[model samples]
Target: ANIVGGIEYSINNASLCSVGFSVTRGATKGFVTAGHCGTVNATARIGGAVVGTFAARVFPGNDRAWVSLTSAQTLLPRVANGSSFVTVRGSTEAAVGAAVCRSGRTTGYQCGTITAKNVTANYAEGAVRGLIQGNACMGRGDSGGSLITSAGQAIGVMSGGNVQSNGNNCGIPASQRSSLFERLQPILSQYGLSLVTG
Candidate 1:
């Protein structure tokens, strides 16, 4: 569930991912998520109430977007961490092999180690580059969620999971599919954003 303007919004869209983090561009306020979620001007709602609209978005080459909040939606410094919550301290990217965790609507909380960085992933939509690859696995509807370090460091945004194409079926089950995440540094720079972390 995504808390929007103080109410929880069900993460229902199959194509859309999870809300990544709070963002601010000058005085305007909103949040960032997977660009695969939608394009500019697209309506984003909670239940039946409109929360905001996609201010800008980019996919394929990059997987990040900014949503413009419409009302007095007080931005918070929290990201889901299973049954609890994690306070986002900063957007400093973590190094490879560092412990990472992601929290999405479907997958409450998942933890694993970062395997590689600066990787690219070719999806059905298009090819996304400069992604952080990891051994962590998450289920569907978890895309666009927060990939944070144990120390409350914001690492990246969930780009794509469900890596079923590798047909070899190695050690873990395919259901708990691994994921590819988009680095947040480039996104922050491109969007001229300052991450709202406390």
Candidate 2:
């Protein structure tokens, strides 16, 4: 079963939203999360120890950030279902209709199928265009979590979800996800970071 751990951070001075994922770009290793989740120049720790530094962060207009580690860390980019763990083989900008899953400290683990492809979601901060919409249910703490395909491929990040008190839900579309990552890819590469693939 998927276990959600409560991790406290120092930099953002706030608890993580429960949706975060480990990533390695080139030789730099760190995790990726929502930009609005915290402030820039903040530090991140797990189990009360420093893990990495928030290198580049963007909020308001775009809610994305990439953390750069001072040293290499061990991270498994896998998603867990109640029955088994799916190893993330690689990250693909997945197509519409591709099945996907997500895990968060708050919601634990959930599975769903991709719905639309590219959708523009308008948040209070600004408009985030190109997000993958699925049927997965998430909560407040699930931001910055992973959205993976059953085949073990990283598809998108859980930025937000439409979950009602009655349990109705919807997710961002994947085509929109491809666009968001495409914009962030250059920023990452400029920092000598490469997105994790296979």
Candidate 3:
């Protein structure tokens, strides 16, 4: 029943993405992820278990979404790091050039610095603004995962990046690799949700 961030989940049996962070709306529990991954009411499942359903979603302009969890599932203020885990204490925004790490289904745990803030990423579908830019290496299916500080502060969710071959390459230079993420603050405010802080 313990669920943490960076775990892989499929929307409606398709559109695989990673969990962002555990969240709460009053007594209701859930997790946030990339909005482009699914729409509202879409079923979200982790492995073979039914986790929850998309409660709210936003895309094209902003990639953010939250899933209302089933009663059987409980939220943990932590992110998956291979077999271990990292605790999340709060959603405190990190400054530029600060060291940040992200957990994803592909790269697992990758550390890098925050390169920029309020960056607007232009995707083929549309442009997403007010993003946090970093050099952390991540791959496809890493979207919607947790981005946090080394001190256990929640920062953002995986958005997109210039992924190299198969997306397994973490040796790419910071200049050649760009990772974008949706700011956690905006997502929480937009959904009126609070993170399940540890």
Candidate 4:
């Protein structure tokens, strides 16, 4: 199957997160996602088939990670937007107030404004710095999802959001609750990778 950003991938079948973006290290194909999805060497599967392995990860302080894909899967420079798709044109950072959209299995496709950048988010594990905060509502299964501008430029990966009293993700109120995303360019530079853009 063709692998694209915003699609769901199960981490060892125990939990699931969205793909941040389709990326590559020279000729080796892969994808990036939130580091909290799994640890180094963890297997990433789509359904019952193993597709990739976690080559690197960073969590607690910062959320970022990349999966080295097998030859069986095709890497595409696109993001799943519910019923449609968004072509990944580049990874240029956008302004704080610019319009942005998110994609994930749990929330489908949602749009919002980039409220702030270089923000720090306090998570149960620890506080992660250099995060981008937005007003989009994100819940479970949205972590590592793709965050892009309305113009199709890649930006960040879903990190965390407010949880409900019952430990579920907030959805109904839309822009009331804030969502955090890890910046994309820093992760790519840290891993010496490049976004696979169309």
Candidate 5:
């Protein structure tokens, strides 16, 4: 899985969530994922290896957050593409109809075109204001995953297509069986993080 976005793992209260992407704040190294994925959660473990700790998280209105990686874990600007990983060269937000793709634990690798943006949806948890809505069919354990463009630009962290029972669910499935994403620029600004480009 290469520790890229879409690899699932164990956390404090969550049993599974796809990895987002490598990030940094000065010399600090960590990653970003759907904020809702680690509300009050403690540790982040991948393949039974202690990788990071949950520093802060925010869900509902905004679905993105940052983790403080352990010294053992390394942040790399690459994502698990089909058979290999592609370097995440930049953070240029994607536009509608842009060819995009993502990997999920349950659904594997999938690609689709963004059908809409600035989309809003109400979940059992709360309402999400702005999202990149698309027809990418993702299942459980996919939220907090990575969503990247075909050109190697990191787009955003995935929200989800199917909401899980309990707190694992992302939101009410948007119309047309679509998925949602929180934009990256705001996430970077909030956490004072700069995208780790390849």
Candidate 6:
């Protein structure tokens, strides 16, 4: 089934969840989301059924994870943000202050400009540095979503954001994401995995 924006689903029926951004780095076919959403041995479902398995996950301190899907699934790096549906071809780190947008189950679609890069966001879990701050409004269930540039390049995965009366939000920077992916790519490659995308 095709994942859409604002679709309500549940993981373990406790934490309400939604679709994050899709990605294909090399041969790995899956999406990126909040690491705390689940654990390494946890199972995940979409539309009330098993979709994929959690292959690699890190939470609390790092707050990132890569959900490796089974062979029966296909990874389509595309996200719809109400106004337009974007094609996420590949991930090329976006510069700070670049235009960006996000899609989540809670906030649906929100647009804003990047505010800062290489920032350290201290969360209850711990402090995560190398984040790209943006004005995009985000809320619960938005974690592990996609943060992309107007050119349709995947920048970073939506980890978490600050809540404000003005409805502004932010996420981890693409540079840090790039580094993480780079480190993980070798591991994925060793397992004969690749990123699935257009």
Task: Identify the leading candidate in terms of TM-score.
Answer: 3
Task: Return whichever of 4 and 5 wins on lDDT.
Answer: 4
Worst 10 residues of 4 by lDDT: 166-175
Worst 10 residues of 3 by lDDT: 166-175
**lDDT, candidates in the order shown:** 0.73, 0.57, 0.89, 0.88, 0.77, 0.59
Best by lDDT: 3
Better model by TM-score, 4 or 5? 4
Q: Which residue pairs clash within candidate 4?
A: none
> Candidate 3: where are CA atoms >4 Å away?
168-171
| Each candidate structure's count of clashing pairs | 2, 14, 0, 0, 2, 11
TM-scores for every candidate against the unseen true structure: 0.85, 0.74, 0.95, 0.95, 0.88, 0.76
Model 5: residues with Cα > 4 Å off, grouped in runs: 163-175
Model 5 agreement with the true structure over 73-125: per-residue lDDT tens digits: 76778877667787889887788888888766766667787888998768788
Candidate 2 global CA lDDT score: 0.57
Q: List runs of model 6 lying over 4 Å from the truth.
A: 3-9, 24-28, 164-195
Report the lDDT tens digits of candidate 1 across residue range 115-167.
Answer: 87888887888898889987777655667788888788898888877544442
Residue 147 alpha-carbon offset, candidate 3, angstroms: 0.6
Where does candidate 2 stray beyond 4 Å?
1-11, 80-84, 163-192, 195-198
Candidate 3 per-residue lDDT, tens place, 1-198, comes to 577999888889967888999999998899989988898899999886788899999997899999999878878999998899999999888889999999978788898999999898899989998899998898888999999987899999999988777664476776778899999999999989999988
- Candidate 3's C-alpha lDDT? 0.89
Give me the displacement of residue 28 in model 6, in angstroms.
5.9
**How many Å off is the CA of 5 in candidate 4?**
1.0
